[PDB]
Predict the structure.
Amino acid sequence: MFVKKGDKVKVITGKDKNKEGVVLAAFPKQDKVIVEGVNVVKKHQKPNQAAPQGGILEVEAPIHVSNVMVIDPSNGEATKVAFKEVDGKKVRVSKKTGEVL
Amino acid sequence: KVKEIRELTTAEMLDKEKQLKEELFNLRFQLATGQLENTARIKEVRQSIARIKTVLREQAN
Amino acid sequence: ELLDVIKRPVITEKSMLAMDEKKYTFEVDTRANKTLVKQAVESAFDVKVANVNILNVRPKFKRMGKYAGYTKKRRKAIVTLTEDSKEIQ
Amino acid sequence: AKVCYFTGRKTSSGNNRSHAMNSTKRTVKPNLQKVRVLIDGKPKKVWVSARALK
RNA sequence: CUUCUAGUGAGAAAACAACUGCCCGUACCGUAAACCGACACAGGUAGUCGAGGAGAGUAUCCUAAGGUGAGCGAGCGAACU
RNA sequence: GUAUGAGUAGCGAAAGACAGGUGAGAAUCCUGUCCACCGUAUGACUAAGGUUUCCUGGGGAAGGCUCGUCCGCCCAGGGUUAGUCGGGACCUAAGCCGAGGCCGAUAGGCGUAGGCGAUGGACAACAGGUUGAUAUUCCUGUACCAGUUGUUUGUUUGA
RNA sequence: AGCUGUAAGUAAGCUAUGAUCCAGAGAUUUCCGAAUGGGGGAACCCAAUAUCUUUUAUAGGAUAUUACUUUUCAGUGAAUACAUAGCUGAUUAGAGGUAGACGCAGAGAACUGAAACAUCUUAGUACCUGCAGGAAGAGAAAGAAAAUUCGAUUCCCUGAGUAGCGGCGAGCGAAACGGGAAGAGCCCAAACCAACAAGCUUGCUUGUUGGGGUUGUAGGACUCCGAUAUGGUAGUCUGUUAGUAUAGUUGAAGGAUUUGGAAAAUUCCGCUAAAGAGGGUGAAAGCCCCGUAGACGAAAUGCUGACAACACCUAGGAGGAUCCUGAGUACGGCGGAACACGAGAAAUUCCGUCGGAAUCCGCGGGGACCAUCCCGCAAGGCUAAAUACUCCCUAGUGACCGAU
């Protein structure tokens, strides 16, 4: 999906613009992604098997995948991603000076 | 896992078919009386039987 | 085919009382005989059988979510023994 | 009386026409008679046209 | 079913014992609120059983065994139907 | 889709009353007592037909011509047991189908041998007990019908 | 790199030793149904014969085979002797459905128009039945014409609402010439000559196989010499490659600012284009995501070309003694129909019924009929393309709809 489940990522659009975080889960075929600490939401649960005291709880919500950008692990600036011919495990070979991501 | 079923003979084939059919009988009796923690083993046995039967068809032309 | 014939036991309140007179209830295959069931039970447990009895059960109209249709058909056989026992739990 | 064995003459349709040119439907038939012939040894009673016996 | 022959055609009669015997239906309503009448409808629905007194009787009135109080009520006690 | 007629006609034959229960709530549900109705039927059993409406535990939004704590309604589980009863592995009636056959623009119509087809023929088990729901089917006692195994003379035919 | 459909919910699991997912080829495939062992109220019931199984045994389970017709071959076979009906067995093919379409046949209306209604129209339309094919049907002159001709069939333009037909009313309605799309031609019968069998006329009559031979400028047989080579195919589940359909790969270029919950909007300053088609993203994006222009790819199976083999087919000149060239046929009377042509002065083409030729010194046609001239050679078979239709699969399009 051009973004994987273990991955550091920066946010382009939507109220968390400029935040970073490690990807938490990938949902292909709906093209969304959960990022750590990024789209916090407040629910209201009644007691059930998990947390028999259901308070007002807060977890992340999935954002759309094109609101996101990969970060080169070694250098730290967000990059568009391209594919090139290494010994034939084709990996995302970063733009912005041809390094492996 | 046909790579092992192809390491045997057509007599031990029919033998393991007997064994797996009997396992299915016993699993089916567990599931009804309130046992069988691991319910994913019923599908696995069905599919191992299917594999033996295809491999036996292939080899006898 | 002697090992696809018996499907499973029946465990209801009317069937617990039968286990105290040496009777056992199984859902058996449709297209099975009194005699075929008897052979299968004598083969799979090493008992001696007096008298299979056999019934058919009609399907039931059900209706969940504005979609209605019937459950399966069923075959129930009750097996009586001379002297031996099978332990199901 | 359905066809003949050697030709194919069968029945068809025609018109009557009655002096004021009214037309109704009608049947036309061939002149078939039952005869014994030697078609491959054993005699057979078949319908044959009189024009093919002529 | 019972006889008579024609008939491929070792030697089966009857004692005890113990064994074998398949498939389909089987609930419940059924002079009815469960069937036919669009209805929880004063209509229709084959057959068997169907008690006592008084009586020729399965008529008539009152009852036995059994069943039932019927799915809108409380008042008033005019005209009229 | 909504008015008017209008809170009007009607609420589909018939005897109830009181005490006490349950409940948020009772003329209408439960239990009792007395009263009243049918009784060649409004009682008991069964063939069609229906097809789960049958039993147990919960429910009260709609259905029920009022009400409802109730129900042939709604949700969850459960119930139908046969050598001998009724049907097949037996017989045939009316009628139907019909190898060959005979007829006929086509399609097809008829019909022989031989079959299907009960409303009729033939054909071996009874009395009692038991469940919340099945009983000539389960159980008890005592039977009967058709077979199978074992232990108790020339296929000419007088076996 | 995640996954166990809709489908939430939970429980158990699978996957970097490559899941899930995608394309080609396989395997399995209950029961009913043409339904085909016999029956039947479709999805059920009941068998026969062999082999195998459960049981001490009977009862029980499995697998194969078993309809009808035709068309080929053996066995058996008879009213009736020889043998033909028949019967048993082995072999060969059919049978049913549809794409509510397109084609060719059989049979075949009515309301309606004529301001009524019979001829006529609606109309050989609708409906029904048979047979198909991927297209069908027609097709290689017994033709179109009129001097100076042209050469198989089909389809389009035009001729033309003409020439005609018609209670001469309502109305029906051509063709050839001229211009185009596409183009292609072939095989038998007969005479005669051999091999075989029967009639052994031991005359050569009946036949079976092979050869020869296919036409109007008449052609062939037959006799005479030449040649014994050369032009082609509408052919095969034969090889050699080339492409192609069915999965995919890669694919340029943006940040800050203002208003908002959120910008793709506003304002600044940049970049990219063989790519400014389209869709998505918290509002309107060439530069965020999927794509697009361009470049690349197939283990397997199926299609279409090309060139190879293999299979088939194809010769001149002369002669004019004799033989051949499709018979109950062409044609005629009677009754019907088809031709735009309603019996008309009615040629041409069919069907039923009866009568019934000629043989190259011949036979048919040029719209009754005759004479003369001109053009053809029936009564045997096949054939691509140019034209019709869309149940379905792929890729798209619309001054077409937008929940009565």
User: Anything to note?
Assistant: Chains C and A do not touch (no CB pair under 8 Å). The longest helix of chain C spans residues 34-45. The CA atoms of residues 51 and 80 of chain C lie 6 Å apart. Residues 1-89 of chain C form one domain.
